[model samples]
Target: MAGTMTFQFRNPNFGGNPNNGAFLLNSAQAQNSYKDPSYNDDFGIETPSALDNFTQAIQSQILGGLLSNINTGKPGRMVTNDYIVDIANRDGQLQLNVTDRKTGQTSTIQVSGLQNNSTDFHHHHHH
Candidate 1:
């Protein structure tokens, strides 16, 4: 006789604990790279300071809340000091777009199978 064993998922997004999902989400979003088109260091590229990283960590927390709002099936657009964040859910798929105000750099993040039952969440941008 052959036996079958179920394997557990490493990512909370698949079917793990809700708490892990928040941390994972933050980790994933924190990996987004920023490119400053206007500022160029002639000597060499300098890494972000600890204070800068701390600030971004806080910003990511706020943005994470916005993502949760989007996950709950509501679309929204929020402008911060450095970037504009927009998020929407489409037929169970969540898409977020972050645009830098100064650099004009745009980054998009999409999550599928996040809202299969929902039929809402989109924003109308005039700009």
Candidate 2:
């Protein structure tokens, strides 16, 4: 079954950019791209939509835990994508798989250690 979900970062500092607009992760481009040395171009790209959906679903758990803290006027700490991905991978809720568009050099990240935050999201407030 396929589904769609929307999520926002609780704290703006985690990966949110007000200038860039809310709803992180661009649906137009890859969140991360692997370049092929032989072709001198991107061999494959990771889907940002998939990553964002995964993060939001996993964070619902943390948000639930923080409900009481929020009601008590405690600031909710930002939940990084790394934390979400880590928990999902550990709990077997999500799988990290990478596929190459050309060479088909698939890479699978069964254990989440690398950060999945947007590397291309840019916000220019001074401009």
Q: Backbone clashes in each candidate structure, one number apiece?
A: 1, 0
lDDT for each residue of candidate 2 in 40-122, tens digit (9 for 90 to 100): 53332333343445545544544443343223322333344433212223232233334444455434344446567767556
Q: Write the per-residue lDDT of candidate 1 for residues 38-96, one digit (tens) a residue.
A: 34754222445333455456555656556554454343566577877776555555566
What clash count does candidate 2 reach?
Answer: 0
- In candidate 1 the C-alpha lDDT for residue 26 amounts to 33
The lDDT of each candidate is: 0.54, 0.39
**Candidate topping lDDT:** 1
Model 2 accuracy (lDDT, Cα): 0.39
Query: Which parts of model 2 are misplaced by more than 4 Å?
Result: 1-47, 71-127
